[PDB]
Design a protein around this nucleic acid. Structure first.
Ligand SMILES: [Mg+2]
Ligand SMILES: [Mg+2]
Ligand SMILES: [Mg+2]
Ligand SMILES: [Mg+2]
Ligand SMILES: [Mg+2]
Ligand SMILES: [Mg+2]
Ligand SMILES: [Mg+2]
Ligand SMILES: [Mg+2]
Ligand SMILES: [Mg+2]
Ligand SMILES: [Mg+2]
Ligand SMILES: [Mg+2]
Ligand SMILES: [Mg+2]
Ligand SMILES: [Mg+2]
Ligand SMILES: [Mg+2]
Ligand SMILES: [Mg+2]
Ligand SMILES: [Mg+2]
Ligand SMILES: [Mg+2]
Ligand SMILES: [Mg+2]
Ligand SMILES: [Mg+2]
Ligand SMILES: [Mg+2]
Ligand SMILES: [Mg+2]
Ligand SMILES: [Mg+2]
Ligand SMILES: [Mg+2]
Ligand SMILES: [Mg+2]
Ligand SMILES: [Mg+2]
Ligand SMILES: [Mg+2]
Ligand SMILES: [Mg+2]
Ligand SMILES: [Mg+2]
Ligand SMILES: [Mg+2]
Ligand SMILES: [Mg+2]
Ligand SMILES: [Mg+2]
Ligand SMILES: [Mg+2]
Ligand SMILES: [Mg+2]
Ligand SMILES: [Mg+2]
Ligand SMILES: [Mg+2]
Ligand SMILES: [Mg+2]
Ligand SMILES: [Mg+2]
Ligand SMILES: [Mg+2]
Ligand SMILES: [Mg+2]
Ligand SMILES: [Mg+2]
Ligand SMILES: [Mg+2]
Ligand SMILES: [Mg+2]
Ligand SMILES: [Mg+2]
Ligand SMILES: [Mg+2]
Ligand SMILES: [Mg+2]
Ligand SMILES: [Mg+2]
Ligand SMILES: [Mg+2]
Ligand SMILES: [Mg+2]
Ligand SMILES: [Mg+2]
Ligand SMILES: [Mg+2]
Ligand SMILES: [Mg+2]
Ligand SMILES: [Mg+2]
Ligand SMILES: [Mg+2]
Ligand SMILES: [Mg+2]
Ligand SMILES: [Mg+2]
Ligand SMILES: [Mg+2]
Ligand SMILES: [Mg+2]
Ligand SMILES: [Mg+2]
Ligand SMILES: [Mg+2]
Ligand SMILES: [Mg+2]
Ligand SMILES: [Mg+2]
Ligand SMILES: [Mg+2]
Ligand SMILES: [Mg+2]
Ligand SMILES: [Mg+2]
Ligand SMILES: [Mg+2]
Ligand SMILES: [Mg+2]
Ligand SMILES: [Mg+2]
Ligand SMILES: [Mg+2]
Ligand SMILES: [Mg+2]
Ligand SMILES: [Mg+2]
Ligand SMILES: [Mg+2]
Ligand SMILES: [Mg+2]
Ligand SMILES: [Mg+2]
Ligand SMILES: [Mg+2]
Ligand SMILES: [Mg+2]
Ligand SMILES: [Mg+2]
Ligand SMILES: [Mg+2]
Ligand SMILES: [Mg+2]
Ligand SMILES: [Mg+2]
Ligand SMILES: [Mg+2]
Ligand SMILES: [Mg+2]
Ligand SMILES: [Mg+2]
Ligand SMILES: [Mg+2]
Ligand SMILES: [Mg+2]
Ligand SMILES: [Mg+2]
Ligand SMILES: [Mg+2]
Ligand SMILES: [Mg+2]
Ligand SMILES: [Mg+2]
Ligand SMILES: [Mg+2]
Ligand SMILES: [Mg+2]
Ligand SMILES: [Mg+2]
Ligand SMILES: [Mg+2]
Ligand SMILES: [Mg+2]
Ligand SMILES: [Mg+2]
Ligand SMILES: [Mg+2]
Ligand SMILES: [Mg+2]
Length: 247
RNA sequence: ACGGACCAAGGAGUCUAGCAAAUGUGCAAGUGUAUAUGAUUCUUUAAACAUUUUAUACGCAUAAUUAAUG
RNA sequence: AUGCUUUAUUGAGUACGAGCAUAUUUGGUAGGACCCGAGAGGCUUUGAACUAAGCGUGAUGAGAUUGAAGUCAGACGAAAGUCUGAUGGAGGAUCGAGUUGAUACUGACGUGCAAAUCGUUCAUUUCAAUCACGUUUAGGGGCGAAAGACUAAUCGAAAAGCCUAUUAGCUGGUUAUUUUCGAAAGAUCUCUCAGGAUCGCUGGAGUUGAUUAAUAUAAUUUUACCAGGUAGAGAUAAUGAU
RNA sequence: UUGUGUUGAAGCGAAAUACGUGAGUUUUCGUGGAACAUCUCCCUAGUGCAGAUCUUGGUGGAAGUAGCAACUAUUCAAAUGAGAACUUUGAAGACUGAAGUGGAGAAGGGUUUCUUGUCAACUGUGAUUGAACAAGAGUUAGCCGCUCCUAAGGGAUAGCUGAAAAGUGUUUAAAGGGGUCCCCGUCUCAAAAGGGAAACAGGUUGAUAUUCCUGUGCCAAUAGUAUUAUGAGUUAGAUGGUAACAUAUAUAUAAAUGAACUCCUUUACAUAGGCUUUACACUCGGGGUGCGUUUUCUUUGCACUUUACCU
RNA sequence: UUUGUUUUGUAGCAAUAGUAAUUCGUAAUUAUCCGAAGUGGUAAGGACUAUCCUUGAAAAAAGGAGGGAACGGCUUUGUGCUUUGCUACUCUUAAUACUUGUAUGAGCGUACCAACAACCGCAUCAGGUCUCCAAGGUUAACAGCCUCUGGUUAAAUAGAAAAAAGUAGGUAAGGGAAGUCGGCAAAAUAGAUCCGUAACUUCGGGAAAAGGAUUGGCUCUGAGGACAUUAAUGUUAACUCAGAACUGAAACGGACAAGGGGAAUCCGACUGUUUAAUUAAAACAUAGCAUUGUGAAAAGCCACAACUGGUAUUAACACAAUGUGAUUUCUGCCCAGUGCUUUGAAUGUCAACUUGAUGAAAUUCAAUCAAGCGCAGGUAAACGGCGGGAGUAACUAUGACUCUCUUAAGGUAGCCAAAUGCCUCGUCAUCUAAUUAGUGACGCGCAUGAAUGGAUUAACGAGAUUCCCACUGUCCCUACUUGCUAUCUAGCGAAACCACAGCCAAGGGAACGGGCUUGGCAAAAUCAGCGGGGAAAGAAGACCCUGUUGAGCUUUACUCUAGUCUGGCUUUGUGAAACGACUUAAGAGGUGCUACUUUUAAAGUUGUUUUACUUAUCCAUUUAUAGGGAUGAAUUUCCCAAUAUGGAGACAUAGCCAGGUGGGGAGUUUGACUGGGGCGGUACAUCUGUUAAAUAUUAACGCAGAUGUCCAAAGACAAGCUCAAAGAGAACAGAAAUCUCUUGUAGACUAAAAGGGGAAAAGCUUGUUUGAUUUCUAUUUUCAGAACAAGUAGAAAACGUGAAAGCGUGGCCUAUCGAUCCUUUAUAUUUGCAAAAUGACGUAAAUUACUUACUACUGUGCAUAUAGAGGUGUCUGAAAAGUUACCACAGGGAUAACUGGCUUGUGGCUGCCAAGCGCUCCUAGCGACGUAGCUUUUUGAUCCUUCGAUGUCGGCUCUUCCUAUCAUUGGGACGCAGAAGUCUCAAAGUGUCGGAUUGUUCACCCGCUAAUAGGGAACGUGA
């Protein structure tokens, strides 16, 4: 009868992100001559907090090379950086925490973050607080590098892509029990409108496949297939397996 | 069992198409002057009057029967 | 082959034509169709001055209670550590007036002051708090701490105008006089059982006949003849009981 | 076809020694004031009402009945007037009790405001009252606001999609600009509580006031040329202090050279808790002035004793 | 740059203004305007501390700095750079004069209300509606009560009287919940100081636990600071706190203000939220726990008609989709069913396209690695599920043990008459006097149980229950009082409703009358109450049934559809390899130049597969900013070679076509009969007998039954023969084996129900057969005298049997079955395919070809006439699943759920007879086996009245009637000594109670009593 809650989220009316006090987008530096041939170095002016995101941001200043002036960058800060530090970005920069290097000049076992899955991309992969990847293989003729991602997947990347040495700061923040409904009210207040959640078994049949009944049950197998239409994919999607995991 | 406090005005088997039966009228193996045209028709007349100077417009009837050549 | 024959069978066929036109009435059909009456379906538009949720900018919560971590001082002890007094001001802490609401009297009123009010009594006040303007989301759609709730006294699908005088085997109504004739509530078929078609029962029109105490005719008798297994009877005649 | 009418038509009220089984027809008197029939035979229709919770309009019994009950409360005397429980004046008794029927604003209303007059209807009892009715009046700004800036957002331009109507909004624009020949970089609307040049006190009208009057101040803008005065610098740019820093007082502290380019600061910011300072408020005692009580008491009870912006 | 003091000034504004006074005149003058402190209400600033998985706008506009471009002036040769002097020149503010378009200050708002009558609510409506200011006393207090400044004394009315009854209040002797479903309502408590506080517990609480004492006024004592002369003297405050004496009708938070407490059970962890106008909860949320998908602009989830978007200013400590619901302790077994998911040319089926074979061609046929299903696995914190019967231990009883059916697995740890147990008011204990209630135990549990979460649980709750203390007008049992109404006056002034109307009893009547019949009776007009009746009013019953009337929701109902997955063709270019296809003479052959299958340097062209390239196409980044190799400030070396960049790349994407999946979505449907409907059944198409009343016809969900088949013989004809059974006889042989005789009217048989028929046959056995065949008519049954269907009597052919007359058109007779449209095979010297031809230039002539005359028989495919067949059992013949406790409409008393009416089976009461009981004795008192009635206080049966409506259980209050008499009054009898009782007569005058449990009517206990009888009045009684 009626359009479901999870279908309405795509209209983007009251489900758009809350971003009034956010500070800007976190990108690497634009790929240019210096990083391809040597390196360039910038100065850390501040570490600041971003309302929606858990990891801190470093505010870093480089010096213009084509012209007289200065320029600004926003970069996810790795654990250990400090105000007044000089970091160096380029193909020949020394290996140290906070420098930005191509992944093909790093030995095996190096912990990295803020990685590009394509060259010149300005960084996409390892970004949430407390996360890192591992260099796990260098190809015989260069041109390819193999890494291990936080979820445990393995990937091969172009060997000229860039990343930061070290781990993302402010890690270990899911070890504190939230303990109050108001704390979770304040958490999602600055993210998006997704809290609280009514469960489908407590609605009427018009609004949900689980709704209705004289006893609050599903009455249906709760694992649905990958091909089901939008108003019907609602329980466990394409589940290979259910129940407690034992290994 | 339902409608009705009282009074006045209004208020409901009609019109058109197509078929049949009954009855009145005209002509009769025929009958009906279609659309038009004509006129010393033109307040009335948007009515009425006329029919192309051994005579093939059309309808119904005058002949039936068969899927059909017939 | 211009097919033939008495045969049988069929036609809304033939055996010296009756039609065409035009008044009116009646019947059945289509149309608004004797008059008034739905619950619905569709097309295009108008509303978030109420209320729901998000967002921007601002404003607001008398008074009192309780007493976490940190700090100072004193006592004990070989160390580790323990005990006593003060200080301090935490917490979706506690009473409570405003504010925001609505538990009970199943009180008053119920032709109200009022299409939700009045009185007393209740719940809530540092937080998931409460208000005001501005702004976003529009109808099979939105919004919902979820009651099928709310979306301008309208929501298990808003409001305005059209398609539209939609359809109804079902309720209600249907307008002057006298005179003459006068019913059925059985039967067959039916997605038929509150309906219909068809036969029966009724009225009107018109011929052919009889008007010759006749013939046709008769919900009646008489004379001649025919068919029957019900009332009674039987159980020793058959069957079955006793 | 052939008739009635100002010497009185239709219609209406009451009737008749009248006719008909009946629907009806005909006639008298009164009112009325202008048209009305045809039955000689035909044509024609939106042609005959007791009902449909029928439509529109008017009117009853109920009935001088139900009722005119929240908000503590009224009394004496006078004026006016045809007429005063509810108009005005004086004297009493009381209420609101600063979280006020006290003052000032927004949304909304639109002349309800003021003076004069004044009662047909309204002001659910009266009414001489009134936000009712009639005639004429009344709203004054460089300093209070809008107007300017940007916000959540709206409308647009290029392009793309669609039969269009419309949807979306740099998704490869030779755009928009500003700086004097260069660089930067879409347009526009959206806050009378956010941001933001600048004003105070006294007086004044029937009705306006940080707007009018008086006096004293502030802010912003003010072409070119020439003269005259105010100060400063050089015989292409001043000094003091160890330092933190300081210095132009002319009517008026106005002048301490500085291009392209570049970097910062103000505007500019949450909540809770106690400590502290200063203004406004409140109160106690002296002095002056006026008033009140006074059979008894009382060096006594109350009022006033003020000071803005700007330098 | 020095001293007390030169002395002035509210520092200027400034007294010239404001306020309070005293003056003199019909605008006039004077005097004051100045000395020291306290309290802490309101606002703002300052320096600080702490909190956040929460870190709390921007722009117009203004300012500061770095750096060092340019530059002493007036005329002085020339072509902006070349020549001579003075060492006034450069800024800055103000005023003036002239040239200049006319060289200060735009435009719009401004009255009044802001609710008390100016706004919205139909109004001059007790409602709603945003912001700022805020005095004195009491006090913790901006609370409550009283007051000053300012405001008012007004409300759609007044006067009198004062009874019932109402509404808002106040008291009550003795008892203290006995009232009631229920302590509903009301009382009792309460401020502050000092003492004292349990179980349990997540150690934080519970907690104001529970409890005890004090409190006025007056007169005193003690404690707590600051400052200046020097330990000593002197001045000087604010408010609290602790003690003592005295005093009063023993009173003192004196008015106001202000918790009732305790022992346990159930649910939910907690603060929070919800159905605006009948539900505030145990419902929703929540922290915590667990499961699932996804490494990216070719990804997960979602929006759009397309083009494009949301999450995303994102990146696994993330985003998205679900369950359960704090802590503690736990979370058992099942993958057979249904879902979801993994592998693939070994593998079955499953499209378009393509490729071959054949043919004149249209067609026809065959082959080929798509996805999906099938085949083989995983998964229960996916949907869900988790057994019976017997025997057995030295008194009984029980069953550790055993046997046997049996499942995918057989309910584990726990828990229980639980918000879950029918029987049920379960058994035992406890609580009371008395317990359908409460608590603790028991467990073969109709039908308990593990994130559908199981068992607990401190704290918390306007949540659901039981008991105790305090308290009381809830009650015994009511009385007295105040305001405001009602009442009577002057003024003003409606509405609902209304066929006509309004006294009764019985009768009949649509079975409950105001009106009708027969009786009782019946005398103006008027005031205040009241709730028996007018089956009173409101309003086309919402319950129930009907309608070929709807709508919301569900699904493995009937048809479809968005989206997803999969294959083909086009977009679409340049090369190169490797294997497949259709051809060479070979290969063994089997066959009568020849016919078919078979190992290899191909006759030459086409196909899936792999790889390479860049310009089509797609993506990303930037201001399209250097061609490859070796926490100051920065602006005016060498080697390698002459499409912005990078990544993919003819693959994605996109357009047309094809297949799978698809309640996410759309449209629709979901028979009838029926002692209401539903369930059951078929009485829905047929047949035998009976009801059926001696022609024929005739109903019910009447009675006893049968049909949807069967048979090359069980059909046709002819001949011969005679059956069931019984008796007596015959080696094994008997009750039953084979054989002979005698009797035998059918007692046998004849496919199947039942009825009728049948003896040289209709039965049995033999012989020959296919009339169970082709065509047509007159007609009978049901009936409209319509179709099918099943029969009867015949005619035109060709046959069978029999010697012959004859008989045969299925079964000895009565049942055994099917339209239009469509399809399919048969028949024909019958026809068509819209200008014509197709056997065939066949036969005979003729020539110099457009020659002539003759002929039953003429391409593929399709159509058409006539005859059978494929089926409609709802059988005169639609392609069709559920639910509504969210509901809508048109109707029905044609039809259910009350009262009333007829009946009285069942329920209740009363009779008659005498077997027997009563030691003995039929009848004191009873009464078996039988049998006659009465009543309408039970429950049925029926469907008469009411569906545009007669309020549906019980209790409380109040009146009246009946007798089928419990007590009280007079009597009779006994199995009657007295006492106490039992049976019975006249008799309705007077009575027929207080309580515990339950919503109860009904029950069952504790009591008293004289007795604690039974009933009716629309199941008496809801304006
Ligand atoms: Mg629900
Ligand atoms: Mg659904
Ligand atoms: Mg549940
Ligand atoms: Mg189930
Ligand atoms: Mg009716
Ligand atoms: Mg009526
Ligand atoms: Mg005629
Ligand atoms: Mg014709
Ligand atoms: Mg009509
Ligand atoms: Mg429809
Ligand atoms: Mg609004
Ligand atoms: Mg809002
Ligand atoms: Mg709290
Ligand atoms: Mg009430
Ligand atoms: Mg209330
Ligand atoms: Mg519901
Ligand atoms: Mg209609
Ligand atoms: Mg008659
Ligand atoms: Mg006339
Ligand atoms: Mg009419
Ligand atoms: Mg009329
Ligand atoms: Mg009338
Ligand atoms: Mg009336
Ligand atoms: Mg009255
Ligand atoms: Mg008045
Ligand atoms: Mg007062
Ligand atoms: Mg008061
Ligand atoms: Mg107050
Ligand atoms: Mg006025
Ligand atoms: Mg006036
Ligand atoms: Mg009046
Ligand atoms: Mg006026
Ligand atoms: Mg102005
Ligand atoms: Mg201003
Ligand atoms: Mg914006
Ligand atoms: Mg603007
Ligand atoms: Mg402002
Ligand atoms: Mg004024
Ligand atoms: Mg003013
Ligand atoms: Mg001063
Ligand atoms: Mg004003
Ligand atoms: Mg209005
Ligand atoms: Mg009113
Ligand atoms: Mg009002
Ligand atoms: Mg009273
Ligand atoms: Mg007293
Ligand atoms: Mg008492
Ligand atoms: Mg009791
Ligand atoms: Mg009782
Ligand atoms: Mg109860
Ligand atoms: Mg109470
Ligand atoms: Mg306790
Ligand atoms: Mg709760
Ligand atoms: Mg729990
Ligand atoms: Mg709560
Ligand atoms: Mg409600
Ligand atoms: Mg409520
Ligand atoms: Mg819950
Ligand atoms: Mg959760
Ligand atoms: Mg399985
Ligand atoms: Mg396959
Ligand atoms: Mg067990
Ligand atoms: Mg149990
Ligand atoms: Mg129990
Ligand atoms: Mg489990
Ligand atoms: Mg269960
Ligand atoms: Mg009165
Ligand atoms: Mg009577
Ligand atoms: Mg009556
Ligand atoms: Mg009478
Ligand atoms: Mg009554
Ligand atoms: Mg009805
Ligand atoms: Mg109904
Ligand atoms: Mg429907
Ligand atoms: Mg559906
Ligand atoms: Mg039926
Ligand atoms: Mg008979
Ligand atoms: Mg016989
Ligand atoms: Mg024979
Ligand atoms: Mg036979
Ligand atoms: Mg049928
Ligand atoms: Mg039939
Ligand atoms: Mg349905
Ligand atoms: Mg009836
Ligand atoms: Mg009986
Ligand atoms: Mg009625
Ligand atoms: Mg009644
Ligand atoms: Mg009624
Ligand atoms: Mg008796
Ligand atoms: Mg006696
Ligand atoms: Mg006696
Ligand atoms: Mg009753
Ligand atoms: Mg009775
Ligand atoms: Mg009632
Ligand atoms: Mg009752
Ligand atoms: Mg009553």
């Amino acid at each position: 009868g009626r359009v479901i809650r999870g279908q309405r989220k795509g209209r983007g009316s009251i489900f758009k992100s809350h971003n009034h006090h956010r500070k800007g987008a976190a990108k690497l530096r634009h790929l240019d001559y210096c990083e391809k041939k040597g390196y360039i170095k910038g100065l850390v002016k501040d570490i600041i907090h971003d309302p929606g995101r858990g990891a801190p941001l470093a505010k870093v200043i480089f010096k213009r090379t084509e012209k007289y002036g200065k320029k600004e960058e926003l970069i996810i800060a790795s654990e250990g950086m400090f105000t007044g530090q000089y970091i160096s970005c380029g193909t020949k920069a020394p290996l140290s925490v906070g420098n930005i290097l191509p992944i093909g000049k790093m030995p095996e076992g190096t912990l990295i973050c803020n990685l590009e899955h394509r060259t010149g991309n300005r960084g996409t992969l390892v970004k949430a607080s407390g996360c890192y990847a591992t260099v796990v293989g260098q190809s015989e003729d260069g041109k390819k590098t193999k890494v291990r991602l936080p979820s445990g997947a393995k990937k091969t990347i172009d060997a000229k892509a860039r990343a930061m040495v070290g781990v993302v700061g402010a890690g270990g923040r899911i070890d504190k029990p939230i303990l109050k409904a108001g704390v979770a009210h304040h958490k999602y207040r600055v993210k998006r409108n997704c809290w609280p959640k009514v469960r489908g078994v407590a609605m009427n049949p018009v609004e949900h496949p689980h709704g209705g009944g004289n006893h609050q049950h599903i009455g249906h197998p709760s694992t649905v297939s990958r091909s089901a239409p939008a108003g019907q994919k609602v329980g466990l999607i394409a589940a290979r397996r259910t129940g407690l995991l034992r290994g």
